[PDB]
Design a protein around this nucleic acid. Structure first.
Ligand SMILES: [K+]
Ligand SMILES: [K+]
Ligand SMILES: [K+]
Ligand SMILES: [K+]
Ligand SMILES: [K+]
Ligand SMILES: [K+]
Ligand SMILES: [K+]
Ligand SMILES: [Mg+2]
Ligand SMILES: [Mg+2]
Ligand SMILES: [Mg+2]
Ligand SMILES: [Mg+2]
Ligand SMILES: [Mg+2]
Ligand SMILES: [Mg+2]
Ligand SMILES: [Mg+2]
Ligand SMILES: [Mg+2]
Ligand SMILES: [Mg+2]
Ligand SMILES: [Mg+2]
Ligand SMILES: [Mg+2]
Ligand SMILES: [Mg+2]
Ligand SMILES: [Mg+2]
Ligand SMILES: [Mg+2]
Ligand SMILES: [Mg+2]
Ligand SMILES: [Mg+2]
Ligand SMILES: [Mg+2]
Ligand SMILES: [Mg+2]
Ligand SMILES: [Mg+2]
Ligand SMILES: [Mg+2]
Ligand SMILES: [Mg+2]
Ligand SMILES: [Mg+2]
Ligand SMILES: [Mg+2]
Ligand SMILES: [Mg+2]
Lengths: 208, 191, 117
RNA sequence: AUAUACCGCCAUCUUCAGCAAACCCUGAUGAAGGCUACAAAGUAAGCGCAAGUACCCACGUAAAGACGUUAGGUCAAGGUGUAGCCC
RNA sequence: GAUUAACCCAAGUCAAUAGAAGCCGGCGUAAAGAGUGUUUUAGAUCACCCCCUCCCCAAUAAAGCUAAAACUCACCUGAGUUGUAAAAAACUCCAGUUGACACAAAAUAGACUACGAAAGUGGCUUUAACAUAUCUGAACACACAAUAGCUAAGACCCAAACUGGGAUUAGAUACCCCACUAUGCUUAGCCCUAAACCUCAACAGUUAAAUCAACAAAACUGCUCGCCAGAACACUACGAGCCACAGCUUAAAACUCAAA
């Protein structure tokens, strides 16, 4: 890195700065007087102080980016969010006053809930015991569960099974499926859970 | 191996074709329902047939499971099935000494009496120049010691890029064995 | 009290047969052994087997097993932090009687003298 | 012809940190070995690392990288020892 | 090899052969303390003087006994039990609980360090019982001597060569799993071997001088017996002895090497 170890990462949060002094603790007061003496890295060209900034969608966009083509990756993301919203506005107007209350029309709420419904709670990692590697049901850290949900969704949409369907239509359809606990990405989660359950007897092989 | 034992409370498949202790067909049902039936009737679940696409399981008592297992072992003890043919491999050299070829020839004979398949490979000896016709003569030498006991299951065929030969030997079938005895007797009558 | 060593080794003057046959001289070294890491074992299996039990009974539907699923995640979170807590205390020596490095510097000052000076 | 005679210029460990003159001491003056900082026989020039310099910073990247290891590569860069050819 | 020069001896030179100098040194690991103890004829001065570990702890022989764990049988329950890195084979008059029940083996104590010549000896009881009022001493004898093995008659839980089966492997006459026998036990006779090694002989004495090749378990003195003398051939050949007949004890030489 061209930043010396002395450079600290920037904290981009307006609220963190407008917070009154009285509310601050003696520890939080020390951190603030310390940062005035520290070197701060330049803000990356991705995240800003915008109120419409979503780190999850920004991350999902980077996992869809091919060869540094962020403009295209961003275009696909915003096209997917519009396709989700239009599909819900169509389901909303065609529904009865009672069903309308249960219909979500926010694509950000659908996007987040769709991914949370695909996160695998348990994982399988190879473990060496007695000179033999064994697949073993193991807990997954929170970072890993979020990554797998994204990677599985993107992988499913890139599958060749879809013929001539554009990504914003594929991804929009898969998100709404997972939003309702359906589709092939949820099945992939159930498979990993079934494989973890059938290897329950092999749990002891883990040493942590 | 597949054993005739209680499958347990955990059934691998979601949809299960079930039968009654008396053989009555209960149809297809979810594994959760089967677990309720096992507790309701206090019976254990066994797997009768697995090849069928809808998994076939049967409810049975502990005594019944034993009686079935007793039947099966008598069927085998009385009518034992032949085991799968075990393949024994030998890798020889063209310049193999004659004492070591007799040792391995005696070993091949014991494999043929046990009705095994003997895959014999012959490679070119170290720092030796040999032709495929000379390497193929060793096979005949090995099979000449077993006149009416062994024959070629697969005939000598170049392999490994033509560097080595390879044949498969087997024990003569009962029909082929009676034929050898017949032909041998005819020669005796002629002589 | 340390077991006796009188008449235990094969030596000139000792009539009896040897009691002990040490492969190494019974002389104190100037160092102690290094702290031997304890064999690792799987943890949180109890909570892991309750979550997988509910899945088995509810067709692997997470909606019915929310309470057990959260319990398994809490156990791993607590155990994950336990990895950091133990490691910190293990290096600090909070639980150890003394650290082999600390205990060996002390023996360096009082080395065993099996020879005459 | 000989890289198994070599110079020259290099690969490689090296994405290493060691090498070592001259002394001193231990082992009964054997091959050998030489540290403990609340210190117990080592002192060590030099070389390398490092430091400096180049590029956009003190960062990073370059460059640098000893002694040796593989008779490693190259007699066909050029030069050259030895042997050989000269209608 | 020839050649040049030099070197040694010299009417000689020096190729082969033979001879001439053959023991006061050793024995933890280099060859060597012979598996163990005990005589005679003798040897030693360690015997009179002059003195301090008698008894008990796991010596030995005999007879009797049994706490834990097995096996077997029975009743009641279960459908499986066994096997593990993982399988297969094996059993299914099987497994679990309870009760009854050895001619097998002897947790803990034992962190003790004893007994016995050594080999060996560690459940309980009882009987008998553990040589020598100098020392050394029998390979010419006598009596012993782990384990394995032989002969005969018995017992039989468990283990287990061999053998059979399963697996592995290029092969697997193995290592891994299962079954089972000789054998391990008793009685009566044999056999007489171990890395029978604590590889350190017995008795008496010393801790100063040179402490002392190395390592190991510090270095020595007196005295005695036993043993050793390059490697390999060779725990072999032959002879002899032996209840040993594919055995044991004693034990060479030729050829070979410049090391071991
Ligand atoms: K060179
Ligand atoms: K050149
Ligand atoms: K040249
Ligand atoms: K006992
Ligand atoms: K004990
Ligand atoms: K002996
Ligand atoms: K020994
Ligand atoms: Mg194979
Ligand atoms: Mg040792
Ligand atoms: Mg070279
Ligand atoms: Mg570079
Ligand atoms: Mg540098
Ligand atoms: Mg070369
Ligand atoms: Mg090369
Ligand atoms: Mg010796
Ligand atoms: Mg002795
Ligand atoms: Mg004697
Ligand atoms: Mg005597
Ligand atoms: Mg004996
Ligand atoms: Mg016997
Ligand atoms: Mg047995
Ligand atoms: Mg028996
Ligand atoms: Mg007994
Ligand atoms: Mg012994
Ligand atoms: Mg001896
Ligand atoms: Mg003696
Ligand atoms: Mg003495
Ligand atoms: Mg000799
Ligand atoms: Mg012998
Ligand atoms: Mg003999
Ligand atoms: Mg003889």
């Amino acid at each position: 890195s061209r930043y010396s170890p002395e450079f600290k990462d920037p904290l981009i949060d307006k609220e963190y700065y407008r917070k009154p002094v009285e509310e601050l603790t003696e520890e939080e007061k020390y951190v603030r007087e310390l940062k005035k003496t520290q070197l701060i890295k330049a803000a990356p060209a991705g995240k800003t102080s915008s109120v419409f900034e979503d780190p999850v969608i920004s991350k999902f966009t980077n996992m869809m980016m091919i060869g540094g083509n962020k403009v295209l990756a961003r275009s696909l993301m915003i096209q997917t969010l519009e396709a989700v919203k239009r599909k819900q506005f169509e389901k909303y107007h065609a529904a009865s006053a009672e069903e309308q209350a249960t219909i979500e029309r926010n694509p950000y709420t659908i996007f987040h809930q769709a991914l949370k419904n695909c996160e695998p709670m348990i994982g399988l990692v190879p473990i060496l015991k007695g000179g033999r590697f064994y697949q073993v049901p193991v807990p997954l850290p929170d970072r890993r569960r979020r990554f797998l949900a994204m990677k599985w969704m993107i992988t499913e949409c890139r599958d060749k099974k879809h013929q001539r369907t554009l990504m914003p239509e594929k991804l929009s359809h898969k998100l709404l499926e997972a939003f309702h606990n359906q589709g092939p990405v949820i099945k992939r989660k159930h498979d990993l859970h079934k494989m973890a359950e059938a290897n329950r007897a092999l749990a002891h092989y883990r040493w942590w | 191996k597949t054993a005739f034992s209680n499958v347990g409370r955990k059934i691998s498949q979601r949809v299960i074709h079930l039968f009654d202790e008396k053989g009555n067909d209960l149809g297809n049902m979810h594994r959760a329902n089967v677990i309720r039936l096992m507790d309701e009737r206090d019976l254990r679940l066994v797997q009768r047939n697995t090849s069928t696409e809808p998994a076939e399981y049967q409810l049975m008592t502990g005594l019944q499971i034993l009686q079935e297992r007793q039947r099966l072992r008598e069927m085998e003890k009385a009518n034992p099935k032949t085991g799968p043919t075990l393949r024994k491999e030998l890798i020889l050299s063209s310049n193999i000494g004659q004492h070591d070829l007799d040792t391995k020839t005696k070993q091949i004979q014991q494999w043929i009496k046990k009705k095994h398949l003997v895959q014999i490979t012959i490679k070119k000896g170290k720092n030796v120049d040999v032709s495929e016709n000379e390497m193929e003569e060793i096979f005949h030498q090995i099979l000449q010691t077993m006149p009416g006991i062994a024959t070629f299951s697969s005939r000598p065929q170049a392999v490994q890029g033509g560097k080595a030969l390879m044949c498969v030997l087997r024990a003569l079938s009962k029909n082929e064995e009676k034929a050898y005895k017949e032909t041998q007797e005819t020669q005796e009558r002629d002589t | 009290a340390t077991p006796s060593l009188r008449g235990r080794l094969a030596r000139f003057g000792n009539p009896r047969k040897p009691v002990l046959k040490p492969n190494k001289p019974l002389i104190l070294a100037n160092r102690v052994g290094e702290r031997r890491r304890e064999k690792g074992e799987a943890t949180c299996i109890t909570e892991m087997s309750v979550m997988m039990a509910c899945w088995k009974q509810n067709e692997f539907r997470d909606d019915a097993c929310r309470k057990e699923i959260q319990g398994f995640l809490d156990c791993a979170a607590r155990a994950q932090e336990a990895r950091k807590m133990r490691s910190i205390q293990e290096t600090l020596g909070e639980s150890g009687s003394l650290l082999p490095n600390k205990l060996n510097k002390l023996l360096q000052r009082f080395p065993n003298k099996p020879y005459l000076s």
